[PDB]
Design a protein around this ligand. Structure first.
Ligand code: BGC
Length: 439
């Protein structure tokens, strides 16, 4: 059994579920724009409608209640709040989150809100987006507004979701909005993401909302060398420092690591005198997102590291299923950076789900994923990790970014033609886990 009061949840993000993309005075986000670009998204899909959750949120709140969720992690669409460069608050957008949060509490579900889950308002992008240091101040102003409005109604706040993905997918690879493909920008962007977190945290501390805490969510891929050879070991260590500690090192220690400074030699040009102190001010908790490990070998070619693909066992995303990677990640963070409070803010899997003739959605592979991963999380808790909660990604099948609707991560099936929701077997199973407070 997990600890009494352990927070079992499920997670979503705003662009992935809400729809209502141009309703109620919501401004365009960089993802509204990105999804109009032909060729960027599988099937030419977008989040224009998604799960239609902006309209259907009460149905989704009842589904959360049906499962017995203790907590629900969502993100806030910044462009619903500040549609445009006037910076004026859009009250209808704010009201939606107020109604959502009130509905959570009415059902005894603790809200966890992510301020930034990738859907930057286009107006912030027009002012430089994360290339501009001033975006950190815009993000702090957005945070201040939301925490002034809802701070003591939302007990757990996360600033950023997965800043490494914003850097890599958004600026290195152009896979995600805003679609830049210039690896030399990644340090600058990383710094400004971190600075925005620090300034948002400052805003949060100044407001000091009763009973509320703020952290940040980072993704990680536990790294294993492909062999015991020294060069593979060295490549794996360098890849871990970059892949897994690019953000944690400055957040906890107030410095960038060497792998990061090597990757982005101009990074120190963006660091003003008090930025590292601001970035490293204490967080209340760390959000951990984990799906899969990465297997590394050395290479002779720059940068001397190769990630090796794994054919099996994998999910529909081709991501290796290795629950021991979750245990090892948690133990490593805890050993390296100390026993701070951790929430697993995402863990889950995509499989090709299909209703049967009777309308049931039986997803045993997803059950098996959760069984392994929740079990690994329990072992990490038994071995001294301060794990406070676990959020299944996702409550709902949703818009999976550049994969569009080709990937289903929900524990609840969504027919996107009719918006019908059906609990999958995994949701039924998870309800039982919550009720038992463990496996
Ligand atoms: O890809 C599955 C999930 O990966 C996570 O990196 C993101 O935070 C989610 O938005 C995404 O749906």
């Amino acid at each position: 059994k997990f600890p009494e009061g352990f927070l079992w949840g499920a997670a979503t993000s705003s662009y992935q579920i809400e729809g209502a993309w141009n309703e109620d005075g919501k401004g365009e986000s960089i993802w509204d724009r990105f999804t109009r670009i032909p060729g960027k998204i599988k099937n030419g899909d977008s989040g224009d409608v998604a799960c239609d959750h902006y309209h259907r949120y009460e149905q989704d709140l009842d589904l959360m209640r049906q499962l017995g969720l203790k907590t629900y992690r969502f993100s806030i669409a910044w462009a619903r709040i500040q549609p445009d460069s006037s910076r004026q608050i859009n009250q209808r957008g704010l009201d939606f989150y107020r109604r959502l949060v009130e509905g959570l509490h009415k059902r005894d579900i603790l809200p966890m809100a992510t301020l930034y889950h990738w859907d930057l308002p286009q107006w912030v992008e027009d002012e430089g987006g994360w290339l501009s240091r001033e975006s950190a101040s815009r993000f702090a102003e957005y945070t201040h507004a939301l925490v002034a409005a809802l701070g003591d109604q939302i007990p757990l706040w996360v600033t950023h979701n997965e800043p490494m993905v914003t850097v890599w997918a958004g600026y290195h690879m152009g896979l995600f909005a805003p679609g830049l493909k210039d690896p030399t920008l990644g340090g600058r962007v990383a710094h400004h993401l971190l600075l925005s977190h620090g300034q948002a945290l400052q805003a949060f501390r100044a407001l000091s909302p009763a009973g509320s805490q703020m952290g940040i969510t980072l993704n990680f891929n536990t790294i294993y060398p492909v062999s015991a050879e020294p060069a593979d070991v060295e490549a794996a260590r360098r890849m871990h420092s970059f892949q897994n500690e690019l953000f944690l090192e400055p957040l906890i220690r107030g410095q960038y690591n060497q792998a990061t400074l090597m990757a982005y030699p101009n990074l120190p040009e963006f660091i003003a005198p008090e930025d590292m102190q601001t970035i490293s001010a204490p967080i209340d908790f760390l959000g951990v997102n984990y799906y899969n490990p990465m297997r590394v070998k050395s290479s002779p070619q720059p940068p001397g590291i190769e990630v090796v693909q794994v054919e099996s066992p994998v999910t529909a995303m081709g991501w290796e299923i290795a629950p021991e990677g979750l245990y090892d990640l948690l133990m490593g963070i805890t050993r390296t950076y100390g026993k701070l409070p951790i929430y697993i803010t995402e863990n889950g899997a995509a499989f090709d789900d299909q209703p049967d003739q009777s309308g049931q959605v039986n997803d045993p592979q997803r059950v098996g994923y959760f069984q392994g991963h929740i079990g690994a999380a329990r072992r990490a808790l038994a071995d001294g990790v301060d794990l406070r909660g676990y959020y299944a990604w996702s409550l709902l099948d949703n818009f999976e970014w550049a994969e569009g609707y080709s990937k289903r991560f929900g524990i609840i099936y969504v027919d996107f033609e009719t918006q019908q929701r059906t609990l999958k077997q995994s949701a039924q199973w998870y309800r039982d886990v919550i009720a038992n407070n463990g496996l």
